Amino acid sequence: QYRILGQIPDTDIYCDVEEYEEVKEYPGIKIFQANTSLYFANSESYTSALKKKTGVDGSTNVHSLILDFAPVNFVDSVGAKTLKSVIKEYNEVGVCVCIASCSGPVMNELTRLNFFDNTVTRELLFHSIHDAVLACQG
Ligand code: NA
Ligand SMILES: [Zn+2]
């Protein structure tokens, strides 16, 4: 259900770190992946799993979270609420939250839900996990 991703060397391919020893994460960056939806039924699991699987217990030097939305087909009002809080709360404790591969329909659903404001902007969105890493690295 929830996974942390790492890079296959010399590629643009990201796989589960706990299923492929060959992949390596980037220092200070955690890449978190969920499934088809972020909506009312699983937004609580998502935030919980995001805190746990990443280990940002304010106990490590993780400065950036990348959310892999490639699998996400559907978002609803609660899902959007939750995601927005995730971003603002991680921001408050020094963690940049960026989103990879958010499809046009999801972006559209997010905008209808007034997800984007001066704080949460579309500049947090990237075409790929790759582009996101580059950005989070500065
Ligand atoms: Na793989
Ligand atoms: Zn970033």
Salient structural properties:
monomer; 138 residues; alpha/beta; Transcription Regulator spoIIAA; six-stranded mixed beta sheet; two-stranded parallel sheet; 8 strands; 33% helix; binds sodium ion; binds zinc ion
Structural account:
With 138 residues, the chain is α/β, with parallel strands linked by helices. The strands form two sheets. Strands 2-1-3-5-7-8 form a six-stranded mixed sheet, with helices on both faces. Strands 4-6 form a two-stranded parallel sheet. The protein has four helices and eight strands. It has one domain (1-138): 2-Layer Sandwich (Transcription Regulator spoIIAA), CATH 3.30.750.24. The longest helix has 16 residues, at 77-92. The chain is globular. The protein starts with a strand and ends with a helix. Bound molecules: sodium ion and zinc ion. Sodium ion (NA) binds at residues 15, 20. Homodimer. Interacts (via STAS domain) with CALM; this interaction is calcium-dependent. It is found in: Cell membrane. Residues 1-138 are annotated as: Extended region for STAS domain. This is Prestin. Belongs to the SLC26A/SulP transporter (TC 2.A.53) family. It is classed as transport protein.
Cα separation of the termini: 30 Å
As for the CATH topology, it is Transcription Regulator spoIIAA
Query: How would you write the strand order of the largest sheet?
Result: 2-1-3-5-7-8
CATH architecture, please?
2-Layer Sandwich
Strand content is 15-25%
Specify the number of helices: 4
Bound molecules: sodium ion, zinc ion
**Overall tally of structural domains:** 1
Radius of gyration: 14 Å
Helix content: 25-40%
Number of strands: 8
- Profile the largest sheet: 6 strands, mixed
Global structural class: alpha/beta
CATH superfamily: STAS domain
**Shape, please?**
globular
Task: Please write the CATH class name.
Answer: Alpha Beta
- Secondary-structure element order, N to C: EEEEHEEHEHEH
Protein name: Prestin
Subcellular location: Cell membrane
Subunit structure: Homodimer. Interacts (via STAS domain) with CALM; this interaction is calcium-dependent.
Family: Belongs to the SLC26A/SulP transporter (TC 2.A.53) family.
